[PDB]
Symmetry: C4
Subunit: 82 residues, 4 copies
């Protein structure tokens, strides 16, 4: 898959996760963006996490849609840096 397409896909996941967490869980846009990266990278500090059933369901969807996409994106980035 072309590297630029993978870039767009991961950006779309990032927008999806950030907007979702902001609207469902009520955290700031910046915190929501940070939480999205921490989650799709599988870091999961737990300083932020969903506290509502809708947020829990949403988080499971982000996990499924985002972890693979992020993994493919970082490996493609590797190639351009290295």
């Amino acid at each position: 898959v072309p590297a630029t397409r993978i870039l767009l896909l991961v950006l779309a996941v990032i927008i999806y996760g950030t907007a979702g967490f902001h609207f469902i869980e009520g955290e700031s846009w910046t915190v929501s963006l940070y939480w999205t990266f921490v989650t799709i990278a599988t870091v999961g500090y737990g300083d932020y996490s969903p506290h509502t059933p809708l947020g829990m369901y949403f988080t499971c969807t982000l996990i499924v849609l985002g972890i693979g996409t992020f993994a493919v994106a970082v490996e493609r980035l590797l190639e351009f840096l290295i």
Copy 2:
């Protein structure tokens, strides 16, 4: 491995983890499902975690049976979306 078989295997892991956490740790079905995804994806927020020895042993079994299964499932999903 056919994609549909991998789907069934990951669903079975999800049922196993959710029912186990619900019965052993006493969290709701929804929280238990969420915890199972967070755990087998290796996100591990720590908002929920086992507090009993049986729960700790069970969690190690879910980690061993579930992380690989989930990893193979997300990569297969990638292919159908992308």
Copy 3:
């Protein structure tokens, strides 16, 4: 690498992590075993973590020696189950 050798290697990592956490951080053998799995699987709930400089250094060594070993072990296990 033969599957049985990978089994021995991951068991050795598990012994190393469990004994180290027990002696350095003073948690029970059971908690230490659980923490070792949570750590080398990269789940990282954070319900247990090192609180001493020696424990922090030890944890970095376990991360480096254990995460790859566990990853290879789970993928080999996949093959026998599936």
Copy 4:
């Protein structure tokens, strides 16, 4: 990629993460080093995490630059041990 070059790259990531967390978040050099390993390995205990917007942005950069680099480093280490 030669193993020694991957070693240098992961060391550079470690220096970047440790110095950044120390200066931005004000934790000790030792805690900052530990946090960097926990983060780039994707363990993410959450005992330490950024509490400032700059720290959150920095952490996302470390996640993107560091997780892939660490992953390639551990797999190369595997080969020399095993």
